């Protein structure tokens, strides 16, 4: 769905 940002590391969430 997108970009998400969590430990530090923004990373796709789920497309």
């Given at each position: 769905n997108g970009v998400?940002?969590?430990y530090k590391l923004c990373?796709?969430?789920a497309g």
């Amino acid at each position: 769905n997108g970009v998400c940002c969590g430990y530090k590391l923004c990373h796709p969430c789920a497309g």
